[PDB]
């Protein structure tokens, strides 16, 4: 239910969607885009995290995060 807790869930699905990042160090400063994961898969990660936290809100409320840290915050606030 906290930022760092959520940020761990985000890293899991990211590695799971993009397997070559499995051993890669992931900072709160990292952008899924620069990592570089395409838009369909960024959305896919977001929806996996939403369902992980069973968080049933519009998906557009998770848009606008410039890195996975900012996305952790965004999730934390819901």
């Amino acid at each position: 239910m906290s930022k760092e807790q959520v940020l761990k869930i985000i890293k899991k699905y990211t590695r799971e969607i993009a397997p070559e990042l499995e051993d890669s160090p992931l900072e709160p400063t990292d952008s899924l885009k620069k990592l570089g994961i395409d838009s369909v898969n960024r959305a896919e990660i977001i929806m996996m995290v939403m369902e992980d936290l069973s968080l049933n809100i519009p998906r557009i409320e998770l848009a606008g995060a410039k890195n996975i840290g900012e996305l952790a915050d965004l999730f934390a606030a819901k």
Binding site: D38, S39, V40, A43, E44, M47, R59, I60, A63, G64
Partner: protein, 404 residues
């Protein structure tokens, strides 16, 4: 009552660019466009515009009507986000060059890529209103991507004749769900331009895809997202995104496992993507192209129901449905869409880039221009003698077209 699409015809351009050439020229690996299921995009010449696209899409329909049936067309709706005037609808030019009756309502409809569906629904309601029994409507979605976003944005038009004898697509009357709200996902706040956010646009599409369908489900008792639809056609900015939307729907509505989702994707969704991959995103016409593609590439040995999802940035969306019979599928096949698409000129990268540079001479607001048809002689060789409309000139803002 009976209502739907009596006839459907497509124009997917005279030229196209193979996206592999674009990837190579931009140092990207091919696998990214392959990943997103993009193959080719149709590309508009400077002597083509949304009007000429619309006329060329609609011409085969009109050519097959008797004089009497042609005069029964009493509404022309042009559905576009590539308009040429703040007030004059493209429908006036279309009526002129197809020779339609002067006793005809004419206007143009805008709501990004939802425009086509909105036009179709208004046409359906004209027929169902029974205000003028026997009246037909001609609905043409036409769009061009005039750059002065890029790999996915094509050019094309799809013309629908709508009547009470729906030989091609029989509408499920009242089976409609819709959903919209104001959102800045993509917009076109300047001519020959587009602004927005890829991610927000995708997430909004997915929200609408779920909510519009839920509204349909609430209205249509006992529908099942797998069992009630033999095929599904979607507004398709690119195939990979439709695959993601369908995956999300199957996961949520049916709790399907990944392997079964992928099998279901190949069976019900891939047929509609075939022509989409050959033209790119054609905006409001793209869902109609997917319907045409589903019809030509799917199995219609018995009647089938097709689910349709329309989305337009800004945004608004609709899920609706209809039935195609074996006879309707055979009529659609006589259109030869696949052969038309394969016969287009295949642009080199040098040509494509020259083409972009030259498209400036016909930007929005152009007052006078005289087109050089010999910009690309080999492209002209593919247009001449086929009975295509082209843009010849603009004179004091008046657009002049020519059959060639």
């Amino acid at each position: 009552q009976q209502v739907g699409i009596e006839a459907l015809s497509v124009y997917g351009g005279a030229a196209q660019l193979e996206l592999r050439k674009l990837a190579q020229a931009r140092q990207l690996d091919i696998s990214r466009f392959d990943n997103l299921m993009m193959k080719e995009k149709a590309v508009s010449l400077p002597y083509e515009d949304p009007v000429s696209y619309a006329v060329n899409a609609a011409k085969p329909i009109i050519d097959r009507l008797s004089d009497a049936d042609k005069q029964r067309i009493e509404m022309v709706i042009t559905c576009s986000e590539s308009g040429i005037d703040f007030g004059k609808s493209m429908s006036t030019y279309i009526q002129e060059y197809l020779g339609l009756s002067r006793n005809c309502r004419m206007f143009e409809l805008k709501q990004a890529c939802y425009s086509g569906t909105a036009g179709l629904q208004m046409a359906i309601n004209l027929i169902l209103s029974q205000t003028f029994p026997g009246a037909k409507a001609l609905v043409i979605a036409t769009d061009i991507s005039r750059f002065l976003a890029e790999p996915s944005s094509g050019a094309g038009a799809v013309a629908l004749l709508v009547s009470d004898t729906p030989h091609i697509f029989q509408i499920d009357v009242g089976c409609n769900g819709y959903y919209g709200y104001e959102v800045m996902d993509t917009c076109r706040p300047n001519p020959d331009s587009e602004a927005g956010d890829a991610d927000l646009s995708l997430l909004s599409y997915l929200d609408c895809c779920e909510n519009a369908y839920r509204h349909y489900q609430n209205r249509v008792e006992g529908v099942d997202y797998r069992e009630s639809f033999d095929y599904l056609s979607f507004h398709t900015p690119f195939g990979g995104m439709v695959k993601g939307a369908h995956r999300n729907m199957m996961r949520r509505l049916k709790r399907a496992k990944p392997a079964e989702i992928e099998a279901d994707f190949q069976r019900r969704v891939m047929p509609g993507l075939v022509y989409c991959q050959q033209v790119g995103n054609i905006m409001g016409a793209t869902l109609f192209l997917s319907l045409a593609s589903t019809i030509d590439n799917g199995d219609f040995s018995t009647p089938r129901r097709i689910g349709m999802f329309s989305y337009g940035s800004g945004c608004c969306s609709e899920f609706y449905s209809g039935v195609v019979t074996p006879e309707g599928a055979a009529i659609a096949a006589q259109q030869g869409i696949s052969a038309q698409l394969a016969d287009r000129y295949s642009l080199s990268m040098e040509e494509y880039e020259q083409l972009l540079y030259h498209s400036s001479a016909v930007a929005f607001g152009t007052r006078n221009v005289t087109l050089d048809y010999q910009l690309f002689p080999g492209v002209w060789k593919k247009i001449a003698g086929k009975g295509r409309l082209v843009l010849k000139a603009i004179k004091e803002f008046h657009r002049k077209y020519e059959w060639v």
